[PDB]
Symmetry: D2
Subunit: 331 residues, 4 copies
């Protein structure tokens, strides 16, 4: 009778389905930049966005929706509740309390565990076999919170860690040789913040033992400027926000780069946060970041690097900072 009933013909049984989604908790600039980009790629055919600030969301959501004619992801849903997350393959938590010129440290912490207790677990009740990337901040300590508060195998529960930083690093690093940050290699681990031990021991622009930045050593630590790449790194997180008044794009790209790996089962190794519970001297459910291999099923395996006496020193140190911090609950 209708144009519908006239133009289109409904091929009988099996006229409904479902499968493999992406969901992002909260669309604060970040939650959001980590959105669009999941889109400017084909990671997900259903991307559901869960926020509690109902207003902006159905606004932002509809923006993406109007945007359809460009995406390669037909379904884009939104909810005020986690029911709207049913059967996600990957959930990315980016809700809490973001940034303030000065503030930013692990200050947004007792503050966020609260955000979590609520936000996180519950999401999980929905997509029971989900896999979580934690972006919030605090990534370490939150990964821990979530880890704890959720109760599924770390592998499933992962964190943004230093994937970010390391990248921030490869950038600057390459800013000096005149070589692509893809084409220079260096690792920064420990904490995602100011306890960041880069790990010069292993820094190419060709190969290990091959072009290790060490063999030509204008030092790299023990002097002659390069420490600064590292001081530039850390500070670098800060300087951004002071100016645009937040940390957006670059966090996004990072994550989607984590997703990319997980989803396409790339088994591309990564610096992410996990339980170093009993690695290089650390023996206490401290989650900091370490180079790990990521696939379909989470963290598969870990990569146990060669930190020099103190590279291990420093790391041993973060571990601990990060550690008492965790004498937790809402108490």
């Amino acid at each position: 009778s209708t144009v519908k009933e006239q133009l289109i013909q409904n091929l009988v049984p099996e006229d409904k389905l479902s499968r493999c989604k992406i969901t992002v908790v909260g669309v604060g600039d970040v939650g959001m930049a980590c959105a669009i980009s999941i889109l400017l790629k084909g990671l997900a055919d259903e991307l559901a966005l869960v926020d509690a600030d109902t207003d902006k969301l159905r606004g932002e959501a509809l923006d993406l929706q109007h945007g359809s004619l460009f995406l390669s992801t037909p379904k884009i849903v939104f909810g005020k509740d986690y029911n709207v997350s049913a059967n996600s393959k990957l959930v990315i938590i980016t809700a809490g309390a973001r940034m303030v010129s000065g503030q930013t440290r692990l200050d947004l912490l007792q503050r966020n565990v609260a955000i979590m207790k609520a936000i996180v677990p519950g999401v999980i009740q929905n997509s029971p076999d989900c896999k979580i990337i934690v972006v919030t901040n605090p990534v370490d300590i939150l990964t821990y919170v979530v880890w704890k508060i959720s109760g599924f195998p770390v592998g499933r529960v992962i964190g943004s860690g230093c994937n970010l930083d390391s990248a921030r690093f490869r950038y600057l690093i390459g800013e000096k040789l005149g070589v692509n940050p893809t084409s220079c290699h260096g690792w920064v681990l420990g904490e995602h913040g100011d306890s960041s031990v880069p790990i010069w021991s292993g820094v190419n622009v060709a190969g290990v033992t091959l072009k290790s930045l060490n063999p030509a050593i204008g030092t790299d630590k023990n002097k002659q400027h390069w420490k600064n790449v590292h001081k530039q790194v850390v500070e670098g997180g800060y300087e951004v926000l002071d100016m645009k008044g937040y940390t957006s794009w670059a966090i996004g790209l990072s994550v989607t780069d984590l997703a990319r790996s997980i989803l396409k089962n790339l088994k591309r190794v990564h610096p992410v946060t996990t339980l170093v519970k009993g690695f290089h001297g650390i023996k206490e459910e401290v989650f900091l970041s370490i180079p790990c291999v990521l696939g379909e099923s989470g963290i598969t395996d870990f990569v146990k690097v060669n930190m020099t006496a103190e590279e291990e020193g420093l790391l041993k140190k973060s571990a601990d900072t990060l550690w008492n911090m965790q004498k937790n609950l809402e108490l």
Copy 2:
């Protein structure tokens, strides 16, 4: 003890998985071009290639394998048997008996149903809920064979149909206006070969009723050159092979464009082959191609166009050609 046992750390339980594959039966130039391209995109994280010509395959396969460092699909497997297809989401049959300057018609037919009886069903015993794209040729009649020989809902069993042709068409068509074949629209259906009724009734370069090529009518059929676009289309299939001695690339791209749609659940409508069993006068399990909507779960729905008295005429006609042909078995 080992570098393995030394460099990498095995994150305990859940160190194995599996999920959503692509498989291509036979790697004859086509089977193959329809391969690489599935690769120069991220449709599949596991693409298994099943051929019986064991030799060339483990050669070609290894070529792609050496090729890893570029692909975004970690696993690429090969088999002499269909066991190597376990739990594919999409199987693409491109094995039979391909082309010969002159030959090419629906000649490669009794010839191929044979290829099928064997090849097809069996593949299915493995990935029971698979979805099939039939490229072989004969696409129509084979779709039918396979349909029949397999026994799963058409929706699942699909064919290359004219997606190809229509594209071949939009090309030429646009070759004259100086407008992109994306940006010109026209549909050619019926048979994939020489019974190809384009369907001028509906041919934009803007909109329907809007810029329909009809309203300015330097005719389009009933004279003044354009029939030729169509004569150029059909012939066009032939001229290729005469020269490179086969039909490769363009068939590939087409298919992957079918996959793309299926896999990312795009619900992008397409001209593909299916059972017009009881549409526009045809009432007999004749499979020719018609504009249909494709998603995750197969053909979802059909699009019932407005063929003019004879557009319906011609189509009614193919249907039938195609039809007795189907008084089949190996008999």
Copy 3:
């Protein structure tokens, strides 16, 4: 002596170059979303961002810079001046005075011509043979301003027009059939705002004369709900901002889709703004949008559609609204 002087060897003459850039004036949410996306593609190997709000820029800029390790565009520059735009191939003006719940109409107009007189011309003194996409708003009237104020051939001076709207349209439109907005076709022209005559005469979901939405006509205008798709369209621009408090993503994607076409010389036809100076009755340097073909060198050619008596009516009407408005200068 140095690691530089040690690791890398400088292959003598020809150790410097330059060529084909993208530049975006102002990074207000939009200027910005229209940024990242130019990045989540390979349109430009040098993208310079010119803003006057020096603060946020060197913040936002550095955000993208830290972001390097993901981009396929090595150079990302920023300036407080247009000198920083030298030899751009495409400049996209997105600076002025953006949005306000209610406000939004062609209010941001005397306001912006001012923004222009300054911003625009000057940019041009730098990249003399540049090509401009105008996003600001007002797109029509601004295209005109810029056109005027710059003095290069429209072809070069283009505007966002309704590429946006039409897309906004294909969306909703497809929201009802259950078909992709790529796979449904419809055109909305005239003004980018509330004088938007869609152009039902030509609306497929197959072909013109073929599946024109007209032949089944649950009307489309002259009743039985569809006008609303159009009322939904226009309103649709408004509802967004009311909520997220601005119009970001979808404008971005649109533009980059214009760039894409221009840059890769796609000669993909588009609804954009240009001088309808003497088309369908309009005879006065009124710039509204019409379906045009875009390539390397600008607008190449125009597409002269079939508006029904009044489709031509309405268009004839916008033209004029838009027209007196243009009895301009700063006077």
Copy 4:
């Protein structure tokens, strides 16, 4: 009068242009695979294909042409002559005399310099400022021939070198750790064939000094299986052809990966062939491959690695093999 003259409107002056092309000499399987892939990306908006086997070409060419509706490159041209190459940015020579089970060595050499004398120079007379990637084989010695026979700055004249091999390597290498070949690093240089000194000194799976494969040393050379990765590498070139009867895909991907870098000015370092004329002891216009940085303008700079006494030994050796070979002309 015509639909053309009716549907489309010709926006006056500037209705013609030109700029930045890709050209590939000969479409032998390789010339060809290195074709399609340049397409399954947006490297070129005009790709001209020059072959002398006029027949297959206008066949293969037309195949790609029919293929339009998928490409993001509007113009695809073909010639029997080099006139059809006018103003290419990148020319890729892949014509000569390809492969034979056994044969393959630097046998296809006096044979090819001939192919060159003709093919190469002449191409250049057309696109005088072109940049050449040499794929033929012999890549080394041919790079040299071409270098010589053309007369433009090496930087411009480059070769496939070991980009290939190294990749072939990262593959196998990663086949053992269970880590992506992107995520494992190792370099193989010297000759592209059997004089391939990998360069274990520098082989990560993290960082240099960091995860160098050396520090855990199940040796890597001086025993305990890994030499084989290398023996597997070289042999690996051979085993392919024996089976599919040629080397296609993987060479293609490699090149396009060279183009990608050149064209988008990525300044991504690469192992390619160039004049090691006076590096690590070699002092004679011997072209073998070394890690170099590639951009818009050619090889920009070289990367002078740390070969161990003999890594330098072996390299010193190839150099020379490769060297007398070059006491050339057609004499």
